[PDB]
């Protein structure tokens, strides 16, 4: 195969620990307030300017093979935490390094690194079991605003926007962020359903405005397969013209012949119609048109084993929507009169359909159908003046938005590091089975101070001195690293999700305590 190079013992430990220290010194500066950004060279355009501690970690790839092993294993810590919780990735990386450093010190000839690993995990289990006890559910809509304000680097506008969006959509609603264009942030609460597809012919525009077709109290014709002929399309339009209401035609496509009839009747006397294709792309639209059908109340035509055909339609067989808006790239149905008692049964089917399966894409479009249908979705167009700014402000908004959605399900706990500092008394009652498990528990006991310590450090004060004066203090008191003094937390509004705290700790301790059991390292030769 490929020529390799092996290194044993303390030499390899040091080099890997050198790789860990570098990638963690790069990210540790981005912690808490008074943290500082990191500029990353993009290979093509203007550079990134981040504060998120995974963008910093996934970039840093080191030349040396052994230091790079350290970097990769810290990258995997930072990434496991991000996907699981969405914030707290700096918190994990400093905890990972601290367990690595303290581990590559206790490795003498008589020590057993694997029992040390077992002791670390006993300590970690005990501490996340202590977090859940001192956890408390988030109840008031003000605690939502605080969690957001904190994880957004203390930007209070962000906190009010995410709290407002979560009152008007539901705490488990669908908030999603976009690249805004204006200078300020905007909360847009979409009402109804909308799909990324516009009218076929630019003759349906009846608005004399920004290229819109706008209807009220329309019928809906849902077709699975194409509407080719003049034959299949005529009966529906006779219904629409007779009842004197507009008509929307959502089909796989409108062929040129039925299209030519639609355009004709629009331009003279002036029948009110409009056509758009289906949302797409394949098997999905077959479910989503059916979703559209029952949301409005009607039937999808051409169905496989029902094959409702177009030639025999009836006015109850058409859906009804209060307002219809269609532009050159997107259509919106708003107030479907769809017998809510039945659209709710649909919601229950789709939610059971996701609990069953997972494919990262079947579950993706699955959630698209839920959100599109009921409570409407919120979007957060962020302001800014230049690109790199918007991209920075956007990394902070998503970290705040993940924090709030991870807090509403699993409660809040003190911040500034005090969450973990208030767990050390839990470790002081463990009775280890042997000497090596005692070493592991002592490793975590030291490591729990790292978060509070690294925040004070970036603030410019003595880290460990602040950590001690916190522990001596009462249970609700800790350090506000912005104001630079000690405060009650919840009264002052410093809190963190318990989910982000425990997953960061658990992913760090998980990977770090395994690195420390190594004795050999095998690397590819660095040919050229």
Ligand X SMILES: Nc1ncnc2c1ncn2[C@@H]1O[C@H](COP(=O)(O)OP(=O)(O)O)[C@@H](O)[C@H]1O
Binding residues for ATP: 51, 87-91, 416, 496
Among residue numbers 71 through 90, which ones bind ligand BEF (CB under 6 A)?
87-90
Minimum CB distance to ligand X, residue 379 (Å) = 23
Closest to ligand BEF by CB, 399 vs 507, is 399
Q: d(Cα 276, Cα 262) in Å, to the nearest integer?
A: 12
3-state secondary structure of 176: strand
> Which range, of 121-129, 275-283, 304-312, 479-487, touches ligand X by CB under 6 A?
479-487
Residue 414's DSSP bridge partners are: 495
Q: d(Cα 194, Cα 118) in Å, to the nearest integer?
A: 53
**CA distance readout (Å), 450 to 98, 133, 286, 468:** 7, 22, 53, 12
Closest to its own copies by CB, 239 vs 459, is 459
Closest to ligand X by CB, 175 vs 455, is 455
Which residues, in sequence order, are CB contacts of 283 under 8 Å at separation 6+?
none
- For ligand BEF, the binding residue among 12, 52, 204, 509 (CB under 6 A) is 52
Helices (H), 132-206: 141-151, 156-167
Minimum CB distance to ligand BEF, residue 53 (Å) = 3
- For ligand X, the binding residue among 119, 384, 416, 497 (CB under 6 A) is 416
| 415 contacts ligand BEF (rule: CB under 6 A) | no
Q: d(Cα 444, Cα 99) in Å, to the nearest integer?
A: 7
Among residue numbers 253 through 272, which ones bind its own copies (CB under 8 A)?
254, 256, 259-260, 263-264, 267
**Residue 496 interacts with, from its own copies, Mg ion, ligand X, none (CB under 5-8 Å by kind):** ligand X
3-state secondary structure of 456: helix
Q: d(Cα 50, Cα 38) in Å, to the nearest integer?
A: 6
Kindly give the pairing relationship between strand 273-276 and strand 247-250. parallel
**Residue 522 interacts with, from its own copies, K ion, Mg ion, none (CB under 5-8 Å by kind):** its own copies
| 505 contacts its own copies (rule: CB under 8 A) | no
In angstroms, how far apart are the furthest CA atoms of the chain? 96
Q: Which residues bind Mg ion (CB under 5 A)?
A: 52, 87, 399
Minimum CB distance to ligand BEF, residue 407 (Å) = 14
Name the nearest CA neighbour of 406 among 39, 67, 84: 84
Q: d(Cα 496, Cα 413) in Å, to the nearest integer?
A: 5
| 415 contacts ligand X (rule: CB under 6 A) | yes
Closest to Mg ion by CB, 82 vs 232, is 82
Q: d(Cα 260, Cα 278) in Å, to the nearest integer?
A: 19
Q: What number of chain residues touch ligand X (CB under 6 A)?
A: 26
Structure tokens at 231: 């034959």
> Are 311 and 231 contacting, i.e. CB atoms less than 8 angstroms apart?
yes
Strand locations in 302-340, DSSP E?
319-326, 331-333
Minimum CB distance to its own copies, residue 163 (Å) = 21
Minimum CB distance to its own copies, residue 168 (Å) = 28
Closest to ligand BEF by CB, 194 vs 394, is 394
Closest to ligand X by CB, 306 vs 483, is 483
Closest to its own copies by CB, 8 vs 167, is 8
Binding site for ligand BEF (CB under 6 A): 52-53, 87-91, 399
């Amino acid at each position: 195969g490929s020529a390799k190079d092996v290194k044993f013992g303390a030499d390899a430990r040091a080099l890997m620990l050198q790789g860990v220290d570098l990638l963690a010194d790069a990210v540790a500066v981005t912690m808490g307030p008074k943290g500082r950004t990191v500029i990353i060279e993009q290979s093509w355009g203007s550079p990134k300017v981040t504060k998120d501690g995974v963008t910093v970690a996934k970039s840093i790839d080191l030349k040396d093979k052994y230091k790079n092993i350290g970097a990769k294993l810290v990258q995997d810590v930072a990434n496991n935490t991000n996907e699981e919780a969405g914030d707290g990735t700096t918190t994990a990386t400093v905890l990972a390094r601290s367990i690595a450093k303290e581990g590559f010190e206790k490795i003498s000839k008589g020590a057993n690194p694997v029992e040390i690993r077992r002791g670390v995990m006993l300590a970690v289990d005990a501490v996340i079991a202590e977090l859940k006890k001192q956890s408390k559910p988030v109840t008031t809509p003000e605690e939502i605003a605080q969690v957001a304000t904190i994880s957004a680097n203390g930007d209070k506008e962000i906190g009010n926007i995410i709290s407002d969006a979560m009152k008007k959509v539901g705490r488990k609603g669908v908030i999603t962020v976009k690249d805004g264009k204006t200078l300020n942030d905007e909360l847009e609460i979409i009402e109804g359903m909308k799909f990324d597809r516009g009218y076929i012919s630019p003759y349906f525009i009846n608005t004399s405005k920004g290229q819109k077709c706008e209807f009220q109290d329309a019928y809906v014709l849902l077709s699975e397969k194409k509407i080719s002929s003049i034959q299949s399309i005529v009966p529906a339009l006779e219904i629409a013209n007779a009842h004197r209401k507009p008509l929307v035609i959502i089909a796989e496509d409108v062929d040129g012949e039925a299209l030519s009839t639609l355009v004709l009747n629009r331009l003279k006397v002036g029948l009110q119609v409009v056509a758009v294709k289906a949302p797409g792309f394949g098997d999905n639209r077959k479910n989503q048109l059916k979703d559209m059908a029952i949301a409005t109340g009607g039937a999808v035509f051409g169905e496989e084993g029902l094959t409702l055909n177009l030639e025999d339609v009836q006015p109850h067989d058409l859906g009804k929507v209060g307002e219809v808006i269609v532009t050159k790239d997107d259509a919106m149905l708003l107030k479907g009169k769809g017998d809510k008692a039945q659209i709710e049964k649909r919601i229950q089917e789709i939610i059971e359909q996701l609990d069953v399966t997972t494919s990262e894409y079947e579950k993706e479009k699955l959630n698209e159908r839920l959100a599109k249908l009921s409570d409407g979705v919120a979007v957060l167009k962020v302001g800014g003046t230049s690109d790199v700014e918007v991209n920075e402000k956007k990394d902070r908004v998503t970290d705040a938005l993940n924090a709030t959605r991870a807090a509403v399900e699993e409660g809040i706990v003190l911040g500034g590091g005090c969450a973990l500092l208030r767990c050390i008394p839990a470790l002081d009652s463990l009775t280890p089975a042997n000497e090596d498990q005692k070493i592991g528990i002592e490793i975590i006991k030291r490591t729990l101070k790292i978060p509070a310590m690294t925040i004070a450090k970036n603030a410019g004060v003595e880290g460990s001195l602040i950590v001690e004066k916190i522990m001596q203090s009462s249970s609700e008191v800790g350090y506000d690293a912005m104001a630079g003094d000690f405060v009650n937390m919840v009264e002052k509004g410093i809190i963190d999700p318990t989910k982000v705290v425990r997953t960061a700790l658990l992913d760090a301790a998980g990977v770090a305590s395994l690195l420390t059991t190594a004795e050999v390292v095998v690397t590819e030769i660095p040919k050229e």
